[PDB]
A paper describes a structure:
GTPases K-Ras, H-Ras, and N-Ras comprise the most frequently mutated family of oncoproteins in human cancers, including three of the most lethal forms, cancers of the lung, colon, and pancreas. To better understand their molecular interactions, we obtained co-crystal structures of R11.1.6 bound to GppNHp-loaded K-Ras G12D and to GppNHp-loaded K-Ras WT at resolutions of 2.20 and 2.30 Å, respectively.
We chose to further pursue R11.1.6, which binds K-Ras G12D in the GppNHp-bound state with single-digit nanomolar affinity – eight-fold greater than for the wild type. The loss of mutation-dependent binding suggests specificity is due to the conformation of GppNHp-bound K-Ras G12D, rather than the mutation itself. The asymmetric unit of the K-Ras G12D/R11.1.6 complex contains four molecules, with distinct R11.1.6 molecules interacting at the switch I or switch II regions of K-Ras. Binding at switch I appears to be an artifact of crystal contacts consisting of a few polar interactions and does not significantly contribute to the measured nanomolar affinity. The structures show R11.1.6 makes contact with K-Ras away from the GTP-binding active site, confirming that the mutant specificity is indeed due to the mutant’s conformation rather than direct contact with the mutated residue. Switch I of GTP-bound Ras can be found in two major interconverting conformations, state 1 and state 215. Recent NMR data showed that switch I in K-Ras G12D is stabilized in state 2, while WT K-Ras has a more open and dynamic active site, with significant population of state 1 (unpublished data). In contrast, this R11.1.6 “lysine claw” does not appear to be as strong in the WT structure, in which switch I exhibits a state 1 conformation and Lys32 is oriented away from Glu63. These differences in interaction between Lys40 and Lys32 and switch I residues appear to give rise to the greater specificity of R11.1.6 for the G12D mutant.
Numbering used by the authors:
A (entry chain D): 1 to 6, 10 to 61
B (entry chain B): 1 to 166
The structure:
Amino acid sequence: ATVKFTEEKQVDISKIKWVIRWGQYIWFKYDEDGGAKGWGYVSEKDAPKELLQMLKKR
Amino acid sequence: MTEYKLVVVGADGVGKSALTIQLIQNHFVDEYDPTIEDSYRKQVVIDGETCLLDILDTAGQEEYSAMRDQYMRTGEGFLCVFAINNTKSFEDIHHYREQIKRVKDSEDVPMVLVGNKCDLPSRTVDTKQAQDLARSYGIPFIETSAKTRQGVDDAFYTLVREIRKH
Ligand SMILES: Nc1nc2c(ncn2[C@@H]2O[C@H](COP(=O)(O)OP(=O)(O)NP(=O)(O)O)[C@@H](O)[C@H]2O)c(=O)[nH]1
Ligand SMILES: [Ca+2]
Ligand SMILES: [Cl-]
Ligand SMILES: [Cl-]
Ligand SMILES: [Mg+2]
């Protein structure tokens, strides 16, 4: 599925290439989408489960 | 099932990680992204046989030479990568090869020569030089671009085909 963030924005989970949890938020980078790579962040509260599953143990 | 123990080697910055991450995750490793040494598994179908790729993405500068040798001892086949705009990395190729043969103690080690960054306009290692080198080793040569994903599947699969030929 997709990740909603920020100017709302949706990026498909397969495009997330890097992600960590810090300071109550989840921080991620993603591949070319609409022809441009980029970053985002979502509060740990509103984070999709398959996003959170990409995090390191534990 | 049958697992293939693949080892990606080559000079620093030739695109070992970019090739491996494209194959495994369909992302492009740019200059800001992790390129650190790690292993990756992927199940694939090659010529109608399902198999598992167990891929070691090695460091350009390996910390322990005896560790690197033990990597090569375990490895069943090797992607020797250079960048087509880096003559040193190309000259570094024979180096990796001899190291692999000496450690393996064998003449028929499965091996594919990979010329990466073929998307770039400024080439300094033409196809003929690589094909010639590859010819003298008796191994295939594959041109890749981890950026555009050109030849990524080809490089690794051709390496598997090489192992299937002993
Ligand atoms: N234009 C272009 N740049 C590429 C290509 N492959 C890799 N690069 C760039 O080359 C640089 C190094 O790539 P990388 O995959 O990190 O190389 P590496 O061999 O793993 N280096 P290391 O030994 O330090 O781990 C990065 O800036 C990357 O984006 C390619 O096919 N085309
Ligand atoms: Ca095996
Ligand atoms: Cl990025
Ligand atoms: Cl095997
Ligand atoms: Mg690397």
